[PDB]
Ligand binder design. Structure first.
Ligand code: SFT
Ligand code: C10
Ligand code: C10
Ligand code: C10
Ligand code: C10
Length: 60
């Protein structure tokens, strides 16, 4: 699996066990992702922080 990094023109290959890509962002500014990469479990979205997870190449 491949996922994009903070600057989406750059990407990486996930290590074993991380079969999800993710994009994190502050709920009030959803067009500015503050973090991106590979993860194993999709983090729990809270009141102020939202996470979008997906499982296909450079989907985040
Ligand atoms: C011998 C040397 C030469 C080797 C061959 C050449 C290639 C070497 C490649 C080396 C690098 C591969 C590993 C890199 C993994 C990282 O890219 C990615 C980055 O993913 C995300 O990137 C985002 C930014 O774009 C954020 O930083 C995320 O941060 S966070 O908040 O989610 O934590 C971060 O999760 N992951 C990490 O760095 C994490 O620390 C990975 C921790 C979990 C993987 C290691 C433990 C796996 C479980 C092993 C259990 C026992 C069986 C192991 C079987 C596999 C054996 C073979 C080795 C596998 C090694 C995997 C690294
Ligand atoms: O252009 C912004 C929209 O691009 C589409 C994908 O969304 C990711 C936006 O973050 C891109 C990285 O920040 C901008 C500078 O690079
Ligand atoms: C662009 C495709 C990459 C495919 C390989 C995925 C693993 C990449 C490992 C890191 O890149 C290795 C080659 O670069 C040599 C230096 O390695 C250190 C990299 O440090 C991380 C900073 O570079 C990325 C900058 O972008 C920041 C996030 O947008
Ligand atoms: O599962 C995730 C549940 O998330 C619930 C909140 O909604 C997430 C998506 O938010 C999209 C952006 O909403 C911006 C709201 O702020 C509006 C300010 O005018
Ligand atoms: C700086 C002023 C502090 C005032 C404190 C006293 C008044 C507090 C009133 C509001 O209390 C609300 C409940 O707070 C509970 C603890 O906060 C947790 C917030 O989590 C937000 C995201 O959770 C969303 C639901 O998650 C469900 C499981 O995924």
């Amino acid at each position: 699996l491949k996922c994009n990094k903070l600057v989406p023109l750059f990407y990486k290959t996930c290590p074993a066990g991380k079969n999800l890509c993710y994009k994190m962002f502050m709920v009030a500014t959803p067009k500015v992702p503050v973090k991106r990469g590979c993860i194993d479990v999709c983090p729990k979205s809270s009141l102020l922080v939202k996470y979008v997870c997906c499982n296909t190449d450079r989907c985040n």
